[PDB]
Design an enzyme around this catalytic site. Structure first.
Site, PDB file in Angstrom:
ATOM      1  N   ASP A 109      -2.305  -7.306  -2.454  1.00 20.70           N
ATOM      2  CA  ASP A 109      -1.786  -8.524  -3.045  1.00 20.70           C
ATOM      3  C   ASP A 109      -1.140  -9.453  -2.014  1.00 20.70           C
ATOM      4  O   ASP A 109       0.049  -9.298  -1.636  1.00 20.70           O
ATOM      5  CB  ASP A 109      -0.810  -8.146  -4.171  1.00 20.70           C
ATOM      6  N   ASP A 153      -4.416 -15.989  -2.462  1.00 19.54           N
ATOM      7  CA  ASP A 153      -3.911 -14.881  -3.278  1.00 19.54           C
ATOM      8  C   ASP A 153      -4.978 -13.895  -3.762  1.00 19.54           C
ATOM      9  O   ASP A 153      -5.673 -14.141  -4.749  1.00 19.54           O
ATOM     10  CB  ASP A 153      -3.151 -15.433  -4.482  1.00 19.54           C
TER      11      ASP A 153
HETATM   12  C1  GX6 Z   1       4.583  -7.451  -7.728  1.00 21.79           C
HETATM   13  C2  GX6 Z   1       3.573  -8.422  -8.159  1.00 21.79           C
HETATM   14  C3  GX6 Z   1       2.545  -9.232  -8.601  1.00 21.79           C
HETATM   15  C4  GX6 Z   1       1.442 -10.059  -9.135  1.00 21.79           C
HETATM   16  C5  GX6 Z   1       0.507  -9.193 -10.000  1.00 21.79           C
HETATM   17  C6  GX6 Z   1      -0.873  -9.268  -9.833  1.00 21.79           C
HETATM   18  C7  GX6 Z   1      -1.726  -8.494 -10.600  1.00 21.79           C
HETATM   19  N1  GX6 Z   1      -3.109  -8.663 -10.335  1.00 21.79           N
HETATM   20  C8  GX6 Z   1      -4.155  -8.076 -10.962  1.00 21.79           C
HETATM   21  O1  GX6 Z   1      -4.066  -7.253 -11.863  1.00 21.79           O
HETATM   22  C9  GX6 Z   1      -5.494  -8.511 -10.433  1.00 21.79           C
HETATM   23  C10 GX6 Z   1      -6.621  -8.435 -11.246  1.00 21.79           C
HETATM   24  C11 GX6 Z   1      -7.839  -8.831 -10.734  1.00 21.79           C
HETATM   25  C12 GX6 Z   1      -7.918  -9.318  -9.428  1.00 21.79           C
HETATM   26  C13 GX6 Z   1      -9.192  -9.685  -8.865  1.00 21.79           C
HETATM   27  N2  GX6 Z   1     -10.197  -9.969  -8.393  1.00 21.79           N
HETATM   28  C14 GX6 Z   1      -6.744  -9.342  -8.666  1.00 21.79           C
HETATM   29  N3  GX6 Z   1      -5.559  -8.955  -9.165  1.00 21.79           N
HETATM   30  C15 GX6 Z   1      -1.210  -7.607 -11.546  1.00 21.79           C
HETATM   31  C16 GX6 Z   1       0.159  -7.511 -11.732  1.00 21.79           C
HETATM   32  C17 GX6 Z   1       0.998  -8.299 -10.951  1.00 21.79           C
HETATM   33  F1  GX6 Z   1       2.320  -8.200 -11.139  1.00 21.79           F
HETATM   34  N4  GX6 Z   1       0.746 -10.566  -7.923  1.00 21.79           N
HETATM   35  C18 GX6 Z   1       0.114 -11.830  -7.968  1.00 21.79           C
HETATM   36  N5  GX6 Z   1      -0.527 -12.277  -6.898  1.00 21.79           N
HETATM   37  O2  GX6 Z   1       0.100 -12.632  -8.955  1.00 21.79           O
HETATM   38  C19 GX6 Z   1       0.796 -12.275 -10.175  1.00 21.79           C
HETATM   39  C20 GX6 Z   1       1.980 -11.317  -9.898  1.00 21.79           C
HETATM   40  C21 GX6 Z   1       2.936 -11.149 -11.117  1.00 21.79           C
HETATM   41  C22 GX6 Z   1       3.907 -12.188 -10.496  1.00 21.79           C
HETATM   42  F2  GX6 Z   1       5.191 -11.773 -10.416  1.00 21.79           F
HETATM   43  F3  GX6 Z   1       3.835 -13.420 -11.069  1.00 21.79           F
HETATM   44  C23 GX6 Z   1       3.135 -12.057  -9.159  1.00 21.79           C
END
Ligand code: GX6
Length: 365
Positions: free
Chosen positions: A36, A220
């Site tokens: 991530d 990202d």
């Molecule tokens: C610790 C952390 C974190 C997170 C996060 C990401 C994710 N991401 C996924 O489940 C995912 C699914 C499919 C793909 C593809 N191709 C990539 N990533 C899940 C929970 C998170 F919590 N990481 C990212 N980049 O954005 C969303 C967030 C949640 C947030 F706090 F807003 C940050």
């Protein structure tokens, strides 16, 4: 320039992200960890949530150290909370080293772990500024570089049951064709970059370029979609709708509220011009419908979506490219990925140099 051991060290399932194998504690506990670039915590499941194949068992680790501090992390789709500690962390298909790193032991969460997925934690590869609870909690990669001789860069080839490579501390030239082109990391928090121009099928959107980066643009790997700021998305869909008017589709499809089922050439290429390394110089990255129409297991989701948190260059962008996070030089490299999905008529491209004026005006303050 060649890191055979780290090639193919990433796995996943469509729409569930890319994970790498890691070990935590002594003796080592193997876990699958989501890669991530959009966050900055190393956070792992530490309790028997029913969705999890496995979880960090701190009691089994002689090298575990309690930091006696909790962390509460809400976000839009739920939350996670944990207990902060440190332990010995290694990556079996990564460099032959072992680092003492911060671990957030996750003890309660909501809408965080995915039902049916094969990962049980998240490796936040972005910078200390966005770490929880604050910037004093040293991100894993900062600890890796501080404590070893591993150079301060990593690169990602996301291929899309999916695979790819995380090359830690270097670049593998076999993972891309042509040249790398570099865009400045505008600020070390997220992997923030500046989009200076947007084209659909070569046709410029003709927007104030400040809109492309309202209020940021980031790279990202922890996001599936290409997310565009509301106003940009509105204009982008308008042009995509016009370019693809051979067939009609419901309003909801373009909003990711419906799927569509069955055609590639009806759909336009998307080009992002990024701020180059030189004053008044830019370069262009180009993606295909193969990237922005996601197969759902022949139905497809439209993976370009509106956002209120800026441009998010997620898997939709990254799967077309080999992406070099050149932390030492505060820059991100793009080159055509040797694994990207394409047809016999069009391929993803990275091209330059182009002349672009007033690129500094494109960044939001
Ligand atoms: C610790 C952390 C974190 C997170 C996060 C990401 C994710 N991401 C996924 O489940 C995912 C699914 C499919 C793909 C593809 N191709 C990539 N990533 C899940 C929970 C998170 F919590 N990481 C990212 N980049 O954005 C969303 C967030 C949640 C947030 F706090 F807003 C940050």
């Amino acid at each position: 320039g060649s890191f055979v051991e780290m090639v193919d060290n990433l796995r996943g399932k469509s729409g569930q992200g890319y994970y790498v194998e890691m070990t935590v504690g002594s003796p080592p506990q193997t876990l699958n960890i989501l890669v991530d670039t959009g966050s900055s915590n190393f956070a792992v499941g530490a309790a028997p949530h029913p969705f999890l194949h496995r979880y960090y068992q701190r009691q089994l680790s002689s090298t575990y150290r309690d930091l006696r501090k909790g962390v509460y992390v809400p976000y839009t789709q739920g939350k996670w909370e944990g207990e902060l500690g440190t332990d010995l962390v290694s990556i079996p298909h990564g460099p032959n080293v072992t680092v003492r790193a911060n671990i957030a032991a996750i003890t309660e969460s909501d809408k965080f772990f995915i039902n049916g997925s094969n990962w049980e934690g998240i490796l936040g590869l972005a910078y200390a500024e966005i770490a929880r609870p604050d910037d004093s909690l040293e991100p894993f990669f900062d600890s890796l570089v501080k404590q070893t001789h591993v150079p301060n860069l990593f690169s990602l080839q996301l291929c899309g049951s999916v695979g790819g490579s995380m090359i830690i501390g270097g670049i593998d030239h076999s993972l891309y064709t042509g040249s790398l082109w570099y865009t400045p990391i505008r600020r070390e928090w997220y992997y923030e970059v500046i989009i200076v121009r947007v084209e659909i099928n070569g046709q410029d959107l003709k927007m104030d370029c400040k809109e492309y980066n309202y209020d940021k643009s980031i790279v990202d790997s922890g996001t599936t979609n290409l997310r565009l700021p509301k106003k940009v998305f509105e204009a982008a869909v308008k042009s995509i709708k016009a370019a693809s008017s051979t067939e009609k589709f419901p309003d909801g499809f373009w909003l990711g509220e419906q799927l569509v089922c069955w055609p590639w050439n009806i759909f336009p290429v998307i080009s992002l011009y990024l701020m180059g390394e030189v004053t008044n110089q830019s370069f262009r990255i180009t993606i295909l419908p193969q990237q922005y129409l996601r197969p759902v297991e022949d139905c497809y989701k439209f993976a370009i979506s509106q956002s209120s948190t800026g441009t998010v260059m997620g898997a939709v962008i990254m799967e077309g490219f080999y992406v070099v996070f050149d932390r030492a030089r505060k820059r991100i490299g793009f080159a055509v990925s040797a694994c990207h999905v394409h047809d016999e008529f069009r391929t993803a491209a990275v091209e330059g140099p182009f002349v672009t004026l007033d690129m500094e005006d494109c960044g939001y303050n």
